[PDB]
Design an enzyme around this catalytic site. Structure first.
Site, PDB file in Angstrom:
ATOM      1  N   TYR B  26       0.829  -1.194   0.000  1.00  0.00           N
ATOM      2  CA  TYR B  26       0.000   0.000   0.000  1.00  0.00           C
ATOM      3  C   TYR B  26       0.867   1.250   0.000  1.00  0.00           C
ATOM      4  CZ  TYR B  26       0.911   0.807   4.980  1.00  0.00           C
ATOM      5  OH  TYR B  26       1.509   1.069   6.191  1.00  0.00           O
ATOM      6  N   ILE B  56      -8.684   0.478   9.241  1.00  0.00           N
ATOM      7  CA  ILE B  56      -9.860   1.343   9.182  1.00  0.00           C
ATOM      8  C   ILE B  56     -10.977   0.662   8.394  1.00  0.00           C
ATOM      9  CG2 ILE B  56      -9.026   3.657   9.671  1.00  0.00           C
ATOM     10  CD1 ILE B  56      -8.288   3.791   6.611  1.00  0.00           C
ATOM     11  N   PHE B  99      -5.661   5.446  -1.069  1.00  0.00           N
ATOM     12  CA  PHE B  99      -4.772   4.312  -0.855  1.00  0.00           C
ATOM     13  C   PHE B  99      -4.568   3.555  -2.158  1.00  0.00           C
ATOM     14  CE2 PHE B  99      -5.993   4.930   3.585  1.00  0.00           C
ATOM     15  CZ  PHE B  99      -4.781   4.748   4.217  1.00  0.00           C
TER      16      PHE B  99
END
Ligand code: 7IO
Ligand code: F
Lengths: 321, 107
Positions: B26, B56, B99
């Protein structure tokens, strides 16, 4: 064993902000297993935890102390603060269940704080110097500014005390709790004081703090508050060093003139009105190590803040002892 | 909530299920382009278990829609991310997150 290929230790995850990578902080935090409560107070709780069998320290803040958790998390995440004599930051996390909980994960030091350590153990010349020189080296690292990408601004602790100093397994100490810290950069001369309603420990407050004469817009004033508190910590440590078969019981600074949990007026009458300082036992001058320490304490306790020594000056003197 | 923009396709068959460990690469960016974290920069894949709330909410629901080998763009809303508090010193309050995630494998 419970080990699988691909398992990483904490030291492998930390090699990369002062602590883990940002997204890794949340994962490691919520994989920690709490084990034993080692501290509880107005700040909150401190727990000995475990991540993949490795000991960690978990500070769970109370709702009233959220600004201290903000400052310490912001400081550790924005400033590269890795040093032998500063508490190793691992991760910071917040949960919205169980209402909100604020977590700070640091290294775990089984010996506990210097406050607890001095009450159980006595010291010799080697262990006393190692404790005292380590605190000076960590305080000097905070106060001095380092330039570059891996640098750091000048930092003042503003709540330095034996309870905020942890003893490591090798005998050296490290400084903890940066929630009241202030920052300063020489390139712009800007001072970052922050936003925190928390007040410092009254027993360790400098004279210029108690009579409200401290120059709050000058970063050098906050460093000299640390030096005052550091001198009191020197007085706590040197009492526990044995010389000629004599040693003093542990006592907090000003144990004989103020009560436990003293007030502002208790300190203002003792420190400012009466200009009192901790007594230096006469047997210390019969020992060269405690003679140098006694000289350093008096040079941290000058009513004039500008007359006090610097943290770097104290380390150099301790290195020569 | 969470927008998933596919960059490169996966196998189209193997999607993460509850309890599986997602191995990803990521790179986290603010909506202003400021990069705040990247597993690629350290050449170390990032692992997390789906359903354990270890990341998250936008990451969970976003990675759950990807197949193994897929590279996707995850635009996470603050309520699916770090919300009003954010993370002091990394994530500002009410920060929309972008992301670049690639689901490498599942364990
Ligand atoms: C300020 C000071 C410490 C911390 C810590 C912290 C890191 O490591 C720690 C270890 C202990 C501890 C104390 C006593 C015993 N005991 C005492 C009785 N005898 C056996 C040992 C054990 C562990 C406490 N705090 C921390 C974490 C976050 N913020 C702090 C801010
Ligand atoms: F105290």
């Amino acid at each position: 064993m419970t080990t699988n290929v691909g398992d990483s230790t904490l030291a492998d995850l930390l090699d990369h902000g002062s602590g883990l990578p940002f997204l890794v902080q949340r994962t490691v935090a919520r994989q920690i297993t709490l084990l034993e409560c080692v501290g509880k107070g107005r700040y909150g709780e401190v727990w000995r935890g475990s991540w993949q069998g490795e000991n960690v320290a978990v500070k769970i803040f109370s709702s009233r102390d959220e600004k201290s958790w903000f400052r310490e998390t912001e400081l550790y995440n924005t400033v590269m603060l890795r040093h032998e004599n500063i508490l190793g930051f691992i991760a910071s996390d917040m949960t919205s269940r169980h209402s909100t909980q604020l977590w700070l994960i640091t290294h775990y030091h089984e010996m506990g704080s210097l406050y607890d350590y001095l009450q159980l153990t006595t010291l010799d010349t080697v262990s006393c110097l190692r404790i005292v020189l380590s605190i000076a080296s960590g305080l000097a690292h905070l106060h001095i500014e380092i330039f570059g990408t891996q640098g750091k601004p000048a930092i003042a602790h503003r709540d330095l005390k034996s309870k905020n100093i942890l003893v490591k397994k090798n005998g050296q100490c490290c400084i903890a709790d940066l929630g009241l810290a202030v920052m300063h950069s020489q390139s712009t001369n800007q001072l970052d004081v922050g936003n925190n309603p928390r007040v410092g420990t009254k027993r360790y407050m400098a004279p210029e703090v108690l009579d409200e004469t401290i120059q709050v817009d000058c970063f050098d004033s906050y460093k000299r508050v640390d030096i005052w508190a550091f001198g009191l910590v020197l007085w706590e440590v040197a009492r526990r060093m044995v010389s000629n078969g004599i040693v003093e019981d542990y006592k907090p600074p000003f144990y004989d003139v103020v009560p436990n949990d003293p007030s502002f007026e208790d300190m203002r009458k003792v420190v400012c009105v009466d200009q009192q300082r901790p007594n230096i036992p006469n047997r210390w001058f019969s020992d060269p190590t405690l003679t140098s320490l006694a000289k350093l304490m008096k040079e941290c306790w000058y009513q004039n803040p500008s007359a006090r020594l610097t943290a770097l000056r104290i380390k150099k003197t301790l290195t020569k002892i | 909530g969470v927008q998933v923009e596919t960059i490169s396709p996966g196998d189209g068959r193997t999607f993460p299920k509850r309890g599986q460990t997602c191995v990803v690469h990521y790179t986290g960016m603010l909506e202003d382009g400021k990069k705040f974290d990247s597993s690629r920069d350290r050449n170390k894949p990032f692992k997390f278990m789906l359903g354990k709330q270890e990341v998250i909410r936008g990451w969970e629901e976003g990675v759950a829609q990807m197949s193994v080998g897929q590279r996707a763009k995850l635009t996470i809303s603050p309520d699916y991310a770090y919300g009003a508090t954010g993370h002091p010193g990394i994530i500002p309050p009410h920060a929309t997150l972008v992301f670049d995630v690639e689901l490498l494998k599942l364990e």
